[PDB]
Symmetry: D3
Subunit: 166 residues, 6 copies
């Protein structure tokens, strides 16, 4: 399956790199989308190559979406095209993986009312104000939406997401 | 007046240091409250001494509140006592200045329904979901609440706040 | 009034940013002059846009001068044109504010013999050798010259300087 | 299976964190051993809790071994006890995963002469002088020894190691 | 004499800067060779100008060779041209000074079998597997090869090397 | 000969480490004096062990003095005891080496009037106001006083200083 990552500079490094390799292990094709072509750099200094820009993404051409955390979601969520990609893929029922600040993009997409999930605890009140039934758990699976809180949850996060992709 | 600051490590340096000196110029007494006693350090490496801990704060002892930005508000907003201080002071109509990510504390206090103000634009959707009429302006004055977005707004932010303390 | 700042890379961030916003609050027009156009970066990583170069400054066009600290004054003081600007404005009796290492530029201008003021204590012997009557105080006002020592003095420094620009 | 990691400060962050979560997804119990029982920090600044010291490790109590890279192996490989653990576990035919500089520990254990594998290319001549048949491949499986070169190989590295732990 | 330095980014700063100045004191001409022209930066942030690239070195026109440490030798040792410079100069009996990880270049040149020297202790097993009679001493002089371990040995390292160039 | 170094935190790393090793090469005993015992850290992060405090220094017990640069001299020179050590050793005609900001300590000692030397060019005017005949040269030898400007001058600085210690 073709898996799309929506991210930007100051992504939480392991929250991108871990699902990237975990999904490649399964044989899935992984694509990193950001504002511009070239490279992006994580909070801790890992550099990743951008495969395509948000403007060049056709969400019809992707089967699943991953939203890492860090400070990147606060910039991604102000990009109308990035938010539209997340809005369309999530509302169509495609698998969507979010961790940490990742679901700020889903908040901006307006797709979380009545949905059950988790996030970085520091934004739980924003999740609740967006209509989420917020849970303090290492992983939540609510239909197509697999959500986790922090890097310590990575093992459980992708354990559940990988099931959704097969 | 006695002005309280609710903050923590990874505060945006100038958003704390600027109002601190600006209100000292007026002869106001300025107090930095945080989790623990000792020093806190900004994103850019400035160190400031903590005057008292959140547990030791009596909100009735303080006349006004400043909420700087940075990553600090996401840690402050998970502290029940800090959120209670902001809840009490804001709902009593005492002057409250927020800038950047500062109003995340006010979101968690549940006091912004029907209010008008601004923030860091990256969290405008969270402000809107908290019931704020969000404005893209360098400074907004809504009764007791003076709000600004970023460090470039500092001059206008405290220009309006000092007016409420005199 | 039109207020000129003579500075360069490795300026002490708050010593430039604080008076910049404080004087904008009053409605003064603030201009940052440096070696080259573009931007300069402080010791702590804050970036500020340069409005004009030393070579394009006509001191007659400006009403007041601010000399922040950091390691920038040791670069500025070797620029003949920057030193000439400070020499002319100071000797004409225009308001001049200095803090920390800022007065090293005034030492190189040859205008401090017989004047009273302060600076970072680490350079008090250089101030004294230039003929300054050095005082250990948070702010000194000697006619047109307002001087302070360290960032902890910011509130008193601009409290006195703002009075001269009225 | 109980999986032991031999590491230290300045480990390559993703080379430790990735297999840690990947093996944890399978339900394996993962243990981090180092010089002292507190916290170790990677080259990029991620912190991980040390479960036990090398002195407290009984290799008989562990089923498999992971050797991440970074600058850490050059410290670990000078510890008699750490090298002894790797020597026993490898010579007993237990599964051993190494990546990047990790096999420097196995070079010091004297167990690689006649074996086939890979490493960070920068140390291929050391691997060859240790008697390794060095291969430029993303992953090599030589009986119990699964070896990879760099972080880009993570997906293939643990794809093969997990298969050996089934 | 003309002295050549083979180095790259992430050189150990003092291990390059110390012999560079120490040999200039004697009147020797010092040349820094690396991958590209411009500047290289040490682990601690000192910047050094590159005089020539590896491809433009003729080893017949240099009398001596210095191999500093840091992470740079692991990059240099994968450059065929850099390795053949070291191979030719060392086997011709020209004076060669190495410290710390510096001799990794000599390992890759295949010139150390039967020779006596030292290095960073972390790579002593690689030196031994290359056929070195490894010694734990602050400086070793083995004919044309002067070797030291760590920055604390700088004084003894160049004390011996300077004798070979007089 | 016994050589004393007067320094502190934020010393310029190579300006301390270079003469330290260079004088040890000659067989001189080198002592690092600072405010407190333990370690000091340079601008670029090198750590050095303090041998004695300024309070336990008896200047009769030392034959020569080295004053490295960095931001350390501005701290040292406010210490009455450290300045007294430099005053006594310099006025007794003992060899004194200074580089960069190093001579700020000699300015505070009041011993430079009518002397000839150099320094970091950023403090030329302070040297001149102290009564120095300032020269723009890589090294100046004025009887017992050997002075240089910047790290690029290290080779010439100690080339001349070493000659005074016979
Ligand atoms: Tb951007
Ligand atoms: Tb904390
Ligand atoms: Tb074979
Ligand atoms: Tb296979
Ligand atoms: Tb020549």
């Amino acid at each position: 399956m073709k898996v799309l990552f929506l991210t930007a500079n100051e992504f939480e490094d392991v929250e991108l790199i871990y699902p990237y390799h975990r999904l490649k292990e399964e044989g899935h094709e992984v694509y990193i989308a950001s504002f511009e072509r070239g490279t992006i750099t994580g909070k801790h200094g890992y550099s990743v190559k951008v495969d395509l820009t948000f403007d060049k993404v056709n969400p019809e051409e992707f089967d699943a979406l991953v939203l890492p955390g860090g400070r990147a979601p606060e910039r991604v969520r102000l990009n109308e095209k990035a938010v539209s990609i997340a809005r369309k893929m999530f509302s169509e029922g495609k698998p969507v993986a979010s961790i940490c600040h990742g679901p700020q993009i889903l908040i901006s997409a307006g797709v979380l009312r009545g949905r059950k999930g988790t996030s970085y605890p520091g934004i739980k009140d924003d999740m609740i104000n967006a209509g989420v039934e917020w849970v303090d758990a290492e992983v939540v699976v609510d239909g197509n939406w697999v959500s986790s809180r922090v890097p310590a949850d990575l093992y459980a996060w992708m354990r559940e997401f990988v099931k959704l992709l097969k």
